Amino acid sequence: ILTKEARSYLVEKYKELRKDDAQGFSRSSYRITVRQLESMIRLSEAIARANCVDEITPSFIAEAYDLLRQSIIRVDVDKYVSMMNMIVRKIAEVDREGAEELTAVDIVDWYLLQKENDLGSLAEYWEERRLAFKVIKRLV
Amino acid sequence: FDILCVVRDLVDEEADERLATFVVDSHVRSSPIPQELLMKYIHYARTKIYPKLHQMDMDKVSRVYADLRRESISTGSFPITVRHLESILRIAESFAKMRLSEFVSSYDLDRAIKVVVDSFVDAQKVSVRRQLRRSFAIY
Amino acid sequence: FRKISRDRGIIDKIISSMAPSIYGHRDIKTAVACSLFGGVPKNVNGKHSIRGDINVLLLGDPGTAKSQILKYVEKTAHRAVFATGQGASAVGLTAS
């Protein structure tokens, strides 16, 4: 049984786990689901069973943690922010599944194709178009 | 189904805080009413009290419906209908039961309208963001 | 008892009491409380009773609490029945 307040640490560990795994979504996610937070518990207690230690250690927690991590990696293989997110998203995917390069216009092309779903009004389209264009013009 | 509860959508710093504290709290174990008195409370109120609205000042609701209806027709389909009006009233008087109020009050209405209206909002497509801006007066 | 129901904030307190171990949401529990707590039937002489209940569609998401919440309701409510989907956990939803 872990009464120990080093459990607090576990939170940030849970917290450390999902953040880097939020973007991209093209990573191994999952989510990472809260059920995984819930999983880290039974894992911890498991390692406690292993080592006979009671109230465990933050270290054993880190072991269960890294374990889940490799189990994840094996699965891997505002305006400007949204556009910069597009840049990082496209590159991060294409670097892992390709070199990335090619026609810069295409990036705007498929970008408009994706954001067209979020467009509430024509002003949102026009803004997104002129922003992505502004970023590319600034970038070059 | 009158009330639709739709969960979303992604994690976050604080959300992970808030959650993890709760889970950890649970596993470590080994303001709200005591469960027993609430589970008595409910039965008690359902048996005894039958709240009722009074025709005089509640005409407002009608207006509200209109205020919701037409402006919602511009975007999204349908879903709104007089049914979805009736659910307002009924839910409101449920809250009137929690108040043990014997009659319907404006507070209850506030609560209800927030419930059903946010329910309707959250069902719609992402264009419902455009909806949100008129929810303010309804808020 | 009566003296407790008099404060206005009792509502919120109750909702907060409604699903302790989930940590839940304020909304999704609010619906639960509302439908679980009641409504008025209410028969119009002599014809139609409308409906006195609130039907909650809780639309979940894998990993969300969507199961556990309703399980609470089986413990708390007076008469509460768990039919699962089918297949079945008795009872099976169809009178026969």
Side-chain angles (χ1 to χ4, degrees):
Chain A
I1 295 298
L2 189 146
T3 300
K4 177 178 71 181
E5 292 79 357
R7 66 184 182 277
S8 176
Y9 166 73
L10 186 147
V11 173
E12 287 83 356
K13 181 182 287 178
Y14 170 71
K15 187 183 304 300
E16 74 187 339
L17 196 148
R18 301 181 69 242
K19 293 179 179 179
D20 58 10
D21 294 346
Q23 293 177 335
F25 299 103
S26 180
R27 299 293 294 176
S28 297
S29 66
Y30 298 135
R31 296 291 176 266
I32 303 300
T33 301
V34 63
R35 295 176 64 186
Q36 298 298 100
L37 173 63
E38 183 278 339
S39 178
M40 183 67 73
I41 191 66
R42 71 182 65 190
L43 293 174
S44 65
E45 296 178 352
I47 294 172
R49 304 296 286 275
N51 291 337
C52 177
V53 177
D54 290 346
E55 293 183 350
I56 295 100
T57 58
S59 65
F60 295 168
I61 311 305
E63 292 181 351
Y65 173 72
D66 283 344
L67 189 147
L68 292 179
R69 179 179 293 275
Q70 297 100 8
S71 296
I72 293 170
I73 298 170
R74 292 183 181 175
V75 183
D76 281 341
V77 176
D78 289 353
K79 281 321 164 271
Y80 302 92
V81 183
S82 185
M83 294 300 293
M84 70 186 56
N85 191 33
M86 180 193 52
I87 294 169
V88 63
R89 291 298 176 274
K90 65 177 182 62
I91 61 178
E93 65 179 296
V94 195
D95 62 36
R96 294 183 181 277
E97 68 180 56
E100 199 277 336
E101 293 177 350
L102 295 174
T103 182
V105 66
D106 64 26
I107 72 189
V108 185
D109 296 303
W110 73 256
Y111 186 50
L112 310 158
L113 186 156
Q114 66 176 6
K115 65 182 183 183
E116 64 176 86
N117 62 27
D118 65 36
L119 182 169
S121 301
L122 184 157
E124 300 303 285
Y125 197 64
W126 180 256
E127 69 185 48
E128 284 307 317
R129 181 62 67 84
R130 70 187 301 214
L131 261 79
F133 183 81
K134 289 199 290 177
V135 178
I136 298 176
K137 71 178 182 39
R138 200 193 78 186
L139 182 170
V140 72
Chain B
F1 292 158
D2 55 12
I3 293 171
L4 272 65
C5 295
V6 202
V7 175
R8 272 189 308 119
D9 79 340
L10 180 59
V11 63
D12 169 82
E13 293 177 350
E14 293 177 350
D16 289 346
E17 294 176 349
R18 293 182 183 174
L19 295 174
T21 60
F22 184 81
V23 170
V24 296
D25 181 2
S26 175
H27 285 76
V28 171
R29 298 289 297 175
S30 179
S31 295
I33 301 102
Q35 295 85 0
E36 190 280 336
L37 288 176
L38 64 82
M39 68 177 283
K40 185 185 69 64
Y41 174 80
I42 54 175
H43 187 62
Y44 179 87
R46 297 187 64 182
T47 59
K48 288 182 64 65
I49 192 66
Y50 297 138
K52 297 178 182 298
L53 188 147
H54 301 293
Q55 186 173 355
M56 293 182 286
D57 58 355
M58 304 301 179
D59 296 346
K60 182 191 71 63
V61 176
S62 63
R63 179 177 62 197
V64 176
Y65 179 76
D67 290 341
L68 271 63
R69 184 174 179 82
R70 59 176 182 183
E71 296 181 351
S72 58
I73 61 171
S74 297
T75 60
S77 64
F78 177 80
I80 308 98
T81 305
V82 295
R83 300 176 65 84
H84 203 195
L85 177 63
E86 179 274 335
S87 64
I88 299 294
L89 276 66
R90 186 177 64 253
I91 290 170
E93 68 186 345
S94 69
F95 284 152
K97 288 179 176 179
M98 288 179 73
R99 181 178 180 168
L100 281 69
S101 65
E102 180 274 333
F103 66 91
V104 175
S105 177
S106 176
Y107 294 95
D108 292 347
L109 297 176
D110 293 344
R111 305 287 187 269
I113 294 169
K114 293 305 290 182
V115 174
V116 170
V117 176
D118 69 16
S119 175
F120 161 72
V121 170
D122 292 343
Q124 294 299 101
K125 178 177 73 181
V126 176
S127 176
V128 72
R129 183 174 183 171
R130 181 177 181 170
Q131 181 68 54
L132 295 172
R133 296 178 299 178
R134 63 172 292 278
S135 60
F136 300 159
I138 303 301
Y139 175 81
Chain C
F1 174 87
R2 302 284 289 176
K3 300 304 288 185
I4 290 96
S5 63
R6 67 179 297 276
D7 178 64
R8 294 177 180 82
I10 60 170
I11 294 172
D12 187 4
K13 186 183 292 294
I14 292 168
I15 294 169
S16 177
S17 65
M18 184 59 74
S21 178
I22 293 169
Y23 180 77
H25 307 80
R26 184 178 178 82
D27 184 7
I28 191 170
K29 294 178 182 179
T30 300
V32 173
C34 183
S35 178
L36 174 60
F37 197 82
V40 178
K42 54 185 175 182
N43 192 344
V44 174
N45 187 340
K47 304 306 176 183
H48 56 79
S49 64
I50 312 168
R51 182 174 63 256
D53 292 346
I54 296 99
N55 297 284
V56 176
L57 176 60
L58 192 152
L59 177 60
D61 183 354
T64 305
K66 60 177 176 178
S67 296
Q68 293 177 335
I69 297 107
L70 62 81
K71 293 179 179 179
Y72 174 84
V73 181
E74 301 173 357
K75 183 178 294 296
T76 297
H78 178 200
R79 186 183 298 276
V81 173
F82 177 71
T84 190
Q86 193 172 357
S89 297
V91 289
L93 288 170
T94 57
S96 295

